[PDB]
RNA sequence: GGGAGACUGGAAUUCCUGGUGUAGCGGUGGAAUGCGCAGAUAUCAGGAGGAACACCGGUGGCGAAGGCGGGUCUCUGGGCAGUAACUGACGCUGAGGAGCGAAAGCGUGGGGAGCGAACAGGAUUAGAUACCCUGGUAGUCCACGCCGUAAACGGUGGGUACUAGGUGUGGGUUUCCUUCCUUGGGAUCCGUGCCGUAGCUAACGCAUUAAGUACCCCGCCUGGGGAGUACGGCCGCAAGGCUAAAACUCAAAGGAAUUGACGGGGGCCCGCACAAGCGGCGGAGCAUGUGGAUUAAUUCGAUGCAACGCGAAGAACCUUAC
């Protein structure tokens, strides 16, 4: 296939992972 | 393509003590020479390599003169 | 010169002396497009050599040529950003051309004020090895056996 | 001192070239390097600088009374043969030439590859 | 080189100690930080320590996959071939479930030569939180446990039977030449590559190791984003992993091949392109043209090669448009 599709998937995953790292302490406070 | 001298009925058995046979299959720098040059089969080339290493450890052959 | 070797021009024989050397010399010394001056200059130099050395001009000219004819030359070839001065043997034609070129080139740096005795004097010196072009000839030989370090490329 | 037979160690790298004249027992009596003869930067990686360094080392060892030399040459060749010829030209004698380049048996980890 | 344990060998890098020995070494497209002159680099001799095992060594062997080569010993798993003595359908697949599972990462305790995220300088640049250079912590290594993911790929689930061949190679049995050595050749079983029919495919291509012809069982798919995300739940020390939507939004997103164009992609062939030679320009004075600056205007156009003795083959008034 092409690598455009993998590129879209990796861009979305990278943004989500960065967001998940940015709010670690707030999530830890809320969940527990 | 040559024949394996050990596969013939008159091929000597391979031992790490008998260092002349091993000197036959090592180059002037002490390295083991490729199986294409010697022409011997897979099993006997493996035997020769193991014997050369064993003789090298007991200091009967040099470690790459 | 990309397709193949170029044709070689014929050389007209001299009517006065009968050797191609003098006509080659007058061609080499020719300047600005005046033949007549050129052969009169070279003939005056020949006659002054005649009256000075006491021997024939042809034999002393050939002896001077042999004393100036080189056998090896230097060619510059670049690779990987480094230029190497490979020594190369010389075809006889290039040797003769270089000898005449060197003689005429060192004919023009003298102080003795006119061309004919300049040429005669250097002919005598090259016959005896006292010239300036000869100095460059043994210099070229000195770098020929000096720059032997770059010969395995063979270019 | 007067040692009539010594040894020459030529180490040629991609950035320099250094020649050391030693006694047959490993004591240096004269050394010269490609930047010791007046070269800087990249210019000391050239064969010409190797020639000059070899000539200078040969002369300084010669004034100590050295006649014949065994050559142990080493490193990724940049000015090896030029150094050999410069030793021969400067009035020395080269008896034997041997390449002694350190060869690992796959130990240690080389640095990452440039890009 | 299938796995686990113990002992052990040599080359090389680093550091320390001692000789000889000097003023440079290192690095790069070029340099500078950096190391030395308090004795560096280099060359000898001795010692300490850790990690990986040149040559043999390959599209070659083994393993269910991940993966496995310095030597020796100890313990142990799978495969193939021949004989066919033995049991007598005991077979295949397998929802959930369990076990193994590269690298990175986590916990406790060791170890630490080389390399090297993060971090400091130097250089490049309009700027360089990068590429290049000099240092360098976790980590890489060992013991015992967590995690459970990879472009974990043949992007090809397992079992079985049939369908032209040619030619390499690994393991084993047999017959004909028999010299009884040899890839001597043939036959047969089990692997591993290339080429090729029929057949299949949208095409590329697969082709007895099928993506062909058929039967049994499992997993999965139903336009692209939102999204493998949210809520709920389970697991984990943590990082996070597994199960898994909707509102909304677009009229497409895709796969293969074809013709051009382009490449800071290649290969051949030409040309005064280089080379081999002769004569010049850039240095001086002068004539033109242009850029720039002044004033009333210094009329307008031309502006890498392909503008600069060009429109202009003729500016005192005229020309001339200022």
Give a written overview of the molecule.
This is part of a larger assembly, with chains A (32 residues), B (65 residues), C (155 residues) and D (115 residues). With 32 residues, chain A is mainly alpha-helical. Chain A has helices at 4-22, 24-31. Chain B is mostly helical and 65 residues long. Chain C is mainly alpha-helical and 155 residues long. Chain C has one domain: Orthogonal Bundle (Ribosomal Protein S7). Chain C has helices at 20-29, 35-53, 57-68, 92-105, 115-128, 133-144, and strands spanning 72-79, 82-89. In chain C, helix 4 packs across helix 6. Chain D has a single domain (2-115), classed as Nucleotidyltransferase, domain 5 (2-Layer Sandwich). With 115 residues, chain D is α/β, with parallel strands linked by helices. Chain D has helices at residues 47-62, 80-89; strands at 5-12, 17-22, 28-33, 68-74, 93-99. Chain D has a five-stranded mixed beta sheet, covered by helices on one side. In chain D, helix 1 (47-62) packs parallel to helix 2. Chain D is globular, with a radius of gyration of 15 Å. In chain D, strand 4, helix 2 (80-89) and strand 5 form a beta-alpha-beta unit. Chain D contains two helices and five strands. The C-D interface holds C 82, 148-149 and D 46-47, 51, 81-82, 85. The structure holds one RNA strand of 322 nucleotides. Chain C: One of its GO terms (molecular function) is rRNA binding. Chain C: One of its GO terms (cellular component) is small ribosomal subunit. Chain C: One of its GO terms (biological process) is translation. Chain C: One of the primary rRNA binding proteins, it binds directly to 16S rRNA where it nucleates assembly of the head domain of the 30S subunit. Is located at the subunit interface close to the decoding center, probably blocks exit of the E-site tRNA. Chain C: Belongs to the universal ribosomal protein uS7 family. Chain B: This is Small ribosomal subunit protein bS18B.
């Amino acid at each position: 296939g092409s690598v455009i599709k993998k590129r879209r998937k990796r861009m979305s995953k990278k943004k989500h992972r960065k967001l998940l790292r940015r709010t670690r302490v707030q999530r830890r406070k809320l969940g527990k | 393509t040559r024949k394996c001298v050990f596969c013939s009925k008159k091929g000597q058995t391979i031992d790490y003590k008998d260092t002349a046979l091993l000197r036959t299959y090592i180059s002037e720098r002490g390295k083991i020479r490729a199986r294409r040059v010697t022409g011997n089969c897979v099993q006997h080339q493996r035997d020769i390599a193991v014997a050369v290493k064993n003789a090298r450890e007991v200091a009967l052959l040099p470690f790459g003169s | 010169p990309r397709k193949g070797p170029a044709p070689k021009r014929p050389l007209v024989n001299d009517p006065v002396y009968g050797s191609q050397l003098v006509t080659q010399l007058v061609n080499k010394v020719l300047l600005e497009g005046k033949k007549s001056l050129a052969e009169r200059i070279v003939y005056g130099a020949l006659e002054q050599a005649r009256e000075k050395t006491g021997t024939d001009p042809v034999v002393t000219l050939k002896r001077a040529l042999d004393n100036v004819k080189p056998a090896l030359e230097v060619r510059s070839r670049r690779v990987g950003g480094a230029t190497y001065q490979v020594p190369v043997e010389v075809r006889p034609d290039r040797s003769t051309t270089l000898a005449l070129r060197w003689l005429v080139n060192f004919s023009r740096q003298r102080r003795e004020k006119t061309m004919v005795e300049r040429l005669a004097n250097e002919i005598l010196d090259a016959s005896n090895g006292l010239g300036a072009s000869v100095k460059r000839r043994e210099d070229t030989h000195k770098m020929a056996e000096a720059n032997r370090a770059f010969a395995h490329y063979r270019w | 001192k007067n040692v009539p037979h010594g040894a020459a160690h030529i180490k040629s790298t991609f950035n320099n070239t250094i020649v050391s004249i030693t006694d047959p027992q490993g004591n240096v009596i004269a050394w010269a390097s490609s930047g010791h003869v007046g070269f800087k930067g990249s210019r000391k990686s050239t064969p010409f600088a190797a020639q000059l360094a070899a000539e200078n080392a040969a002369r300084k060892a010669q004034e100590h009374g050295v006649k014949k030399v065994d050559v142990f040459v080493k490193g990724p060749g940049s000015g090896r043969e030029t150094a050999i010829r410069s030793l021969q030209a400067a009035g020395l004698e080269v008896g034997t030439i041997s390449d002694v380049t350190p060869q690992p048996h796959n130990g240690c980890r080389p640095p990452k590859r440039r890009r």
